[PDB]
């Protein structure tokens, strides 16, 4: 419900040394969509990232907690965490509100200290799904999860991933109508990221 | 799910079904049900999936901070006590049932545990969507057995639910604690195979960027 | 308190080529939380034309019997166009308004030299498409038609749409569902129309 | 009787779409205990009170 | 409920609020402040519950400008919004607030303009319609804003928003409070319709 | 919708030359063991049999529409035939909202086809070598389906369905151990005095109580 | 559930199913429901399965802390006035004990659901308690033998399991008497071919 | 959905977007959702496809039999009057149905616009559907009676690609339509990406 | 309310109780609930009192309708069957008969609440009846004598008196044999004071 | 909680009065016919229907 | 609030020099009279008894704060300093929103003044020469007071007390002929054993039913 209200979706996609994490550009206040310009994803560094769907608050706010979380663990560590750790700690705040849980699903994308592509994604309690072939949140997740299934091999090459993710996220959204018009696509590999823009519909 | 649960002469069998889903939607294959809570104790777990792995965390730290302490080797009673008492304060809220078996000083013990706090002693047990469909298996094929024999029966429960309950496929883990040690079985059986579809490939070319920012780690 | 209805539904594809129309539905007729038969067939013929159904399966074949009495009553001077039948089987459904079919009706056929698929909903209104998917896995198999068969999106040149490469997307298609969907079937029975006939394949899906 | 189908479509909002949808007929990955419908833990099995008088409780 | 619309030009930003204060009845006032300037470098209005409203918009003034005394915080309009966006989740899922604000003013970067509504949820936009604006007047928006819009072309889009409320928009509107904030200080514009 | 004498699930299965139809004999009001000989199985007409589960009221309301349209009509009808009209009879009654709280399993031999099918509460029908209705679906269906049904004898099958019939009256409250099975071959409908089936529990002892 | 207890010549005999059920389906039929408070006290559990057993846990470490205190066996009194206090002072656990032991001579108390606590010489509980209240009536004799009163629970709960669906399953008795705890097993195997 | 129709010195202009969903799935994107009943009385349907369409096609023979009967063309009073007493028939039942019955009554163009409540206004202009409010507010500022032909129509076409552009429930093709005194012309169908 | 039939050697042996219950107020505590169909013919009603009795005033005149029209003694077969239509055919009725006569041969036809009709050897109805299931099933007896059934019903009808709140007084009693129905009358002092 | 004392005093309404009411704690001559709340004619004795299935009506 | 197990009724009138109180000894589950020996008169001291009804458990748990109060402070109590401690209890029970479901009445003399109270779950209370509590102030309340119980001596106050218990029986579900009669006078508290009330049902026997 609260999620419908705002919309928007996610798709990680893990090919060979290289993850695509894309999303949509909408806002929504319901059936309206108030800004054509709102990414959902986050970037703590070139190589950890992360994007939430649902109450777009509790997406921001779950953020700035785990901005703050992941420094305080830097400066304890000296040592930068991997995506797991990340993933486990979001997990783990998310739980905390087991009684009043947030309203978001969160998927954790980034590249191992090994230079391994990783992925993600939670529930609104933390339940928490490492992928190795894709994960998807959000209104069109089930036309993203459905279309990445047929389309989606393993070892795809940096562009045949992002050509293929992009298809697949173009597509799905067309068929959601929460889904929104500007995307943006976040390339992935262990030299850093491509951020990385495209366009669909216009509608 | 059909996680299962069979208790032989000097072990248990915890199986389990691969297989994760959010209302008609497959959301994990290969997804591990048998969570790990002590070298000598699994448990195993249907409902909401955050609180089977929390509730299971808890008991694997009060169990590991018990041996370290005392070092001496937790009892499966320890770990269902630990259950029950945090269950029970949340009536049912935080929806976890575990199939909690191990070997202790006393023997093997498999114990079935429910939402609400309740726990008990079983000979075999089926939980999950596919409860029913293995439960009818351990009815018809269970009897005192070896890890053999009850490794091929919880097998074939587990069987049963995955060809028989929509919510249940994939792979079965397996794992079996005996007084010799825990060995697991990770996707022990491949009932739910799938077909071998070719690739496809988009053109680069059906694909335009409208701009690319791009930044490096250091 | 009492629900009329329950939802046996898996997927069902049709998609019209230019020459050929390729209708596909899996064989699994699903209870809740368990699977009654793996051999049910959703698709019925009406002469030259195929019927294929979703939803609650005692209302579609009740639906499925009503247009069919309809048509013989028809026949005694001509045979029914397609899309004399397609306008029927919504009048026929929309009559139900207030105790609805819960089938959704995908009504295909020639029309002496052009292919026709017609989708309805289930108070009645029919398109005319192009692709159309129904069941609880049209969202894992209609984006996919709309890429690789329809080509949307495709900003490139596009790979030639024969009957052979459908065929294939539609396997995928229906892969990708029964991998994904709890509710597909374990057969996907495939039909083929061409202007002088039609024939029937079946191929094998994951048994879960 | 008629369903409210379409009213999303027909008013700004200020989910009836303008095709019927199946599900007419949470963000949790919750998984089913058993089977049975909203069942997943054994039954209370006591003796349960009946009769009596609950319209008059203090006429003991 | 209440109208707003906002504008952000290349060095200026408009916020246009409906200044009458009604129930779902009577109309209790027809010109009401509904703004807060701070250092005259943000201005942010309140919309939503008054009740609610003037109490919370009351307390991020007073802990912005002890902020900026005694911990020498920059208050700019992404500081506004963020200290807004706490203040409104940390009652949400305990007391909530119904009120929601646009926070606008000049940055380092730029002119910012902020939205925060009920639910705390925060965006920027280069323009904002909260209330009942949000249905009505974003074709507007759309179809006469660009990022070249001078500060008359600015207010005169905000008048043909709050036009579209007052011909098609059945609860009454009659009076707009218009502050430009900008590097020459803020701009206090109040219409009729 | 009637829900106050219930009989629990139906059994039928088809075997190398026949089908088998089985049900218990007990009949529930609530938690209740009201009757202990409610039989649920009759014969149609020769070659096919049929089982009803649900409101004992239901059926025996459908078993007399049944039998008077089985008196009136003067051309015999194959089971298939059967099927048809009582499919149609839940499914019209279900469409007038006022449904028969009653699942039915009709089960009969043609001159070469075996006909094994189902009809629930809301006309909803299919056919299958394995029918089961109501908790039998969900605990005997997935134990039954295990066994290659199609190449057992008679005996073979009987004893595969009385195995099964035991499994629910383990598993399920609403189930006794008292059943009653009607068979069907070419030239042959036997419908058995209902017999008891015989139980274990030495799996509940524990460590020494007496065997008393 | 059948839960019985019955004070005899030299003890107590409690006898029990071992049907456990939700809904139409038997999640257990092999559930312990003699569950032991200590070495000369037993529980009958009866009411919310996750309550009882939170009571019984609890009583359980109650009556052995007392007893240590004091110096004395468990009195069963006193882990029935325990019991009494959790199910009173907690009106939203649903619970019902019949908590029968030897401490100096058989006591049978009975916690009702809302707390009402009495004691007995004979006691039945469960959902199947309601169809033989007329035969323990009638059949109830003071002072009975051992082999008598273990009839007199045989013919009770087996009539009891033939009538109400949640009860099944071969009948758990134990003999609390000032010897020990004695356990007996009347299978299933009788009680339904009979 | 986003429907429009307004009367302007010329002639008259109709313009909807062609999208059909079904929650949050788009069901289709080349929905027809203007019914043309003859050369000049068409109707914009909106609401419930198959309930708009079907009072739409049974208001549309109406009119052929009325025409049948008195030779002559039906009023659009007329016409929008059956359409309006048959959803009121299921006043209160649920029905969800809102339509305009564009046409011309020999030399004089009326709109009338018709809802399931039995509600019946004759204007000269109304959007209706989901995206009726961005409509609404795209023709209040530009929206003329003295417009051109050329003008007329793009204000149309431009107000239906605004409400789509901003709501969810719109955003198929932009199908236009110009009601002249000597009937309708199908103008295009408009893809809203291709603006 | 407790309500029973039981077949004796050549009879038909029913009986009740006299309690009327309205919550914890007896409204009365002589109503007669052996309801007389016809002169061979009796049916004890559990239910609603007034549907119940809509039934049993309707199926009196069916019973004698069809008698005289195909010349016959009225069958109670005929008397179960058209209570039987009437409880199915209205849902909103909440009704239950123990029909109970002798034609040619005794015979006792239970039309239980949503018209499930069964013929019985002994029968029992009523809130009462819950609490004598056990009691029946071990007493009860083929081919009693009268004494024998007299006394069955007096045990049995007396046990359930005792516990159910909403079963009281006197215990009417009535057999139905082929030289017709006497009726007979068990005190409720000898059955309260005892 | 505080009952809303006064609302109709205080609004136009477009019955709480300002002072509180007794009995804040028809146009028909009714009567009662017995001095029990609700109870009109004898209780409905039969057995009643528990236990069993309510939510899993259909799985006999 | 306990609504579980349940007493049914308390009378308690003064007569001629003295005090009566009686209650049945039943307690009901329901419909179900699950216990025939549940007493409910309580002495106080020695010039004072409380009888209880309504919830037994909540019975238990007054009488239970009541023996503490009693054996803690060391200054003895008239009758109507129970009344006012029992008034209290119950009153701050009630405006803590978890009242008990019990209603009492409180029986004494001192020097020669006679105490007949009722307090109700409520904490309301008031005191009168006749105070009945549940359906017996109701159906044996209206029938007492046709008596002038002031002028009986305790034979006949007994004997009055028992045909009001004997209407109750007949004419209350949850009220049985087993009874218990407390007395106070000057010097003396008495508890009788329960014992059984003899009842007729005479009314009933008709002309020709054969009495067995």
Redesign the interface.
């Known amino acids: 419900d609260i999620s ?1 209200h705002y ?1 928007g979706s996610l798709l990680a996609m893990i090919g060979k040394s290289s993850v695509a994490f894309l999303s949509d550009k909408r806002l ?1 206040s ?4 108030v800004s054509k310009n709102f990414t959902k994803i986050y970037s703590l560094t070139p190589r950890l990232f992360f994007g939430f769907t649902g109450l777009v608050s509790d997406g921001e706010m779950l953020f700035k907690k785990i901005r703050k979380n992941y420094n305080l663990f830097v400066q304890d560590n000296n040592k930068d965490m991997e995506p797991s750790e990340l993933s486990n700690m979001i997990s783990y705040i998310l739980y905390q509100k087991r009684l009043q849980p947030y309203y978001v699903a969160v998927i954790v994308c980034g590249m191992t200290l090994d230079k391994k592509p990783y992925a993600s994604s939670m529930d609104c309690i933390g339940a928490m799904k490492e992928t190795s072939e894709f994960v998807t949140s959000g ?2 997740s089930k ?1 993203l999860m459905g279309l990445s299934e047929a389309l989606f091999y393993p070892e795809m090459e940096d562009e045949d991933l992002f050509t293929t993710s992009v298809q697949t996220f173009l597509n799905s959204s ?5 889904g929104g018009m500007g995307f943006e696509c976040l390339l992935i590999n262990p030299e850093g990221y491509k951020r990385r823009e495209f366009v ?4 | 799910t059909t996680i299962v649960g069979v208790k032989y002469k000097g072990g248990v069998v915890i199986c389990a079904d691969t297989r994760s889903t959010s209302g008609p939607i497959v959301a994990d294959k290969n997804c591990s049900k048998i969570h790990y809570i002590s070298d000598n104790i699994q448990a195993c777990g249907a409902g909401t999936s955050a609180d089977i792995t929390r509730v299971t965390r808890k008991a694997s730290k009060v169990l590991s901070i018990f041996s370290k302490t005392y070092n001496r080797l937790p009892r499966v009673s320890h770990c269902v006590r630990t259950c029950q008492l945090h269950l029970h304060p949340y009536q049912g809220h935080i929806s976890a049932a575990l199939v909690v078996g191990g070997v202790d000083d006393t023997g093997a013990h498999l114990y079935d545990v429910y939402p609400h706090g309740s726990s008990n002693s079983v000979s075999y047990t089926a939980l999950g969507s596919g409860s029913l469909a293995a439960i009818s298996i351990l009815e018809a094929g269970y009897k005192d057995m070896n890890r053999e024999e009850a490794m091929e029966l919880a097998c074939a429960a587990i069987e049963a639910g995955i060809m028989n309950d929509l919510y249940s496929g994939s792979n079965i883990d397996v794992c079996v604690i005996s007084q010799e040690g825990r060995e697991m079985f990770r996707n022990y059986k491949k009932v739910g195979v799938r077909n071998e579809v070719p690739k496809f490939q988009y053109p680069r070319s059906s694909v335009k960027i409208l701009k690319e920012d791009i930044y490096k780690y250091i | 308190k009492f629900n009329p209805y329950e939802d046996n539904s898996g997927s069902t594809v049709s998609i019209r080529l230019n020459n050929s129309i390729i209708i596909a539905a899996d064989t699994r007729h699903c209870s809740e939380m368990g699977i009654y038969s793996r051999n049910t067939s959703k698709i019925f013929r009406i002469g030259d034309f195929l019927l294929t159904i979703t939803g609650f399966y005692a209302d579609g074949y009740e639906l499925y019997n009503r247009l069919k009495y309809q048509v013989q009553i028809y026949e005694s001077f001509n045979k029914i166009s397609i899309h004399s039948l397609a306008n029927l089987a ?1 009048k026929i ?2 009559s139900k ?2 105790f609805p079919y819960y089938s959704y009706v995908t009504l295909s056929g020639f029309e002496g030299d052009n292919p026709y698929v017609y ?1 309805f ?1 289930c ?3 029919f ?1 005319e ?1 192009d692709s159309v998917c129904n069941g609880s896995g ?2 894992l198999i209609q984006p996919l038609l709309d890429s690789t068969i329809e080509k949307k999106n495709w900003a490139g040149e596009n790979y030639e749409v024969t009957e052979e490469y459908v065929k294939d997307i539609v396997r995928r298609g229906f892969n990708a569902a029964s991998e994904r969907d709890v509710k597909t079937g374990d057969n996907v029975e495939i039909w083929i129309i061409k202007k002088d006939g039609m024939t029937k394949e079946y191929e094998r899906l994951r048994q879960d | ?21 199946p ?1 007419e007929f949470d963000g949790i990955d919750k998984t089913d205990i058993f089977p049975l419908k909203k069942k997943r833990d054994p039954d209370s099995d006591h003796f349960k009170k009946t009769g009596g008088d609950d319209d008059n409780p203090f006429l003991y | 409920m209440e109208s707003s619309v906002a504008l952000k030009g290349n060095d200026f930003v408009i916020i246009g609020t409906d200044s009458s204060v009604k129930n779902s009845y009577l109309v209790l006032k027809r010109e009401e402040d509904k703004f807060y300037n701070i250092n005259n470098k943000v201005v942010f209005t309140y919309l939503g519950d008054q009740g609610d409203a003037f109490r919370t918009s009351s307390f991020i003034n007073e802990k912005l400008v002890y902020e900026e005394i005694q911990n020498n915080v920059e208050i700019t309009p992404k500081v506004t919004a963020n200290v807004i966006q706490k203040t409104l989740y940390d009652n949400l899922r305990s007391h909530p607030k119904n009120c929601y604000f646009l926070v606008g003013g000049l940055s380092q970067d730029g002119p910012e303009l902020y939205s925060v509504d009920l639910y705390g949820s925060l965006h920027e936009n280069d323009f904002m319609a909260v209330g009942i604006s949000t ?6 928006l ?3 804003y660009h990022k070249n819009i001078t500060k008359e072309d600015g207010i005169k889009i905000i008048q ?2 709050f ?2 409320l007052k ?2 928009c059945s609860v009454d509107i009659s009076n707009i409070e218009i502050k430009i904030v900008s590097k020459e200080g803020v701009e206090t514009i109040n219409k009729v319709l | 919708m009637k829900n106050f004498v219930i009989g629990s699930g139906v059994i039928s299965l088809r075997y190398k030359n026949g089908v088998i139809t089985c049900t218990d004999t007990q009949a529930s009001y609530g938690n209740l063991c009201k009757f202990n000989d409610v039989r649920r199985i009759f014969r149609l007409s020769s070659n096919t049999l049929i089982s009803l589960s649900g409101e004992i009221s239901d059926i025996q309301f459908l078993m007399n529409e049944l039998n008077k349209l089985n008196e009136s009509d003067p051309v015999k009808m194959s089971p298939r035939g059967y099927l048809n009209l009582v499919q149609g009879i839940l499914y019209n009654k279900r469409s007038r909202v006022e449904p028969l709280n009653v699942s039915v399993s009709i089960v009969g031999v043609d001159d070469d086809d075996f006909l094994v099918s189902c009809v629930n509460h809301l006309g909803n029908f299919y056919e299958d070598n394995i029918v089961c209705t109501g908790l039998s679906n969900m605990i005997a269906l997935p134990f039954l389906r295990t066994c290659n049904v199609l190449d057992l004898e008679r005996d073979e099958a009987i004893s595969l369905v009385e195995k099964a019939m035991t499994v629910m009256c383990y598993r399920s409250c609403r189930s006794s151990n008292r059943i009653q099975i009607g068979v069907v071959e070419k030239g042959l409908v036997d419908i058995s005095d209902p017999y008891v089936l015989n139980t274990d529990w030495q799996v509940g002892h524990n460590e020494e109580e007496i065997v008393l | 559930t059948t839960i019985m207890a019955v004070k005899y010549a030299d003890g107590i005999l409690i006898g029990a199913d071992c049907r456990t059920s939700m809904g139409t389906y038997v999640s257990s039929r092999f559930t312990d429901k003699l569950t032991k408070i200590s070495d000369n006290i037993y529980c009958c559990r009866s009411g919310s399965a996750a309550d009882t057993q939170a009571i019984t846990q609890y009583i359980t470490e109650l009556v052995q802390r007392s007893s240590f205190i004091d110096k004395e066996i468990p009195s069963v009194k006193k882990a029935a006035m325990a019991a009494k206090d959790i199910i009173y002072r907690y009106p939203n656990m649903l619970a019902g004990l019949i908590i029968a032991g030897y401490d100096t001579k058989p006591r049978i108390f009975n916690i009702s659901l809302g707390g009402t606590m009495t004691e007995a010489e004979w006691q039945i509980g469960g959902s199947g308690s309601a169809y033989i209240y007329g035969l323990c009536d009638t059949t109830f004799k003071p002072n009975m033998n051992l082999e008598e009163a273990l009839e007199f629970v045989k013919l009770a709960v087996t009539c009891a399991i033939k009538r109400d669906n949640a009860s099944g399953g071969c009948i758990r008795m134990a003999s609390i008497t000032r010897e020990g705890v004695q356990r007996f097993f009347y299978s299933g195997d009788k009680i339904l071919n009979s | ?1 986003t429907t429009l129709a307004f009367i302007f010195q010329g002639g008259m202009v109709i313009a909807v977007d062609s ?10 994107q ?2 027809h959702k203007v019914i043309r009943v003859n050369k000049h009385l068409i109707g914009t349907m ?9 009072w739409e096609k049974k208001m549309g023979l109406y009119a052929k039999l009325y025409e049948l009967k008195n030779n002559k063309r039906i009023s659009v009073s007329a016409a929008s009057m059956y359409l309006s007493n048959c959803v009121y028939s ?1 006043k209160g ?6 339509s305009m019955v564009c046409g011309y009554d020999g030399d004089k163009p009326v709109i009338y616009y018709v809802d399931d409540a039995g509600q019946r206004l004759s204007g000269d202009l109304f959007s ?11 023709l ?2 530009s929206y003329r009676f003295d417009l051109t032909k050329e003008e007329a129509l793009n204000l149309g076409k ?2 239906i690609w ?11 093709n932009v199908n236009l339509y110009f009601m002249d005194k000597n009937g309708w012309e199908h103008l295009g169908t408009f893809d ?2 291709k ?1």
């Open positions: 419908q919309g929504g319901g059936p309206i969509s209104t069109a036309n067309d068929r959601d109508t929460f669909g519909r216009c509608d | 919504s459904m929309y308004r207030l989708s909903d108070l009645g209104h398109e498409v049209s969202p | 009787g008629f369903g409210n189908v379409g009213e999303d479509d027909l008013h700004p909002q200020i989910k009836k779409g303008a095709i019927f949808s599900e | 249905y009505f007047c974003y074709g507007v759309d179809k006469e043909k928003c036009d579209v011909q098609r | 959905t999208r059909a969903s079904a929650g949050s799935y788009i069901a289709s080349n929905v909106a609401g419930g496809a198959s309930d708009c369409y079907f299921y039942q649920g029905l969800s149905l809102g209706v559907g989901s995206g009726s409010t961005i409509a609404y507010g795209v209040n500022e431009k107000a605004h409400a789509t552009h901003r709501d969810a429930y719109s955003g198929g809203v990406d603006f």
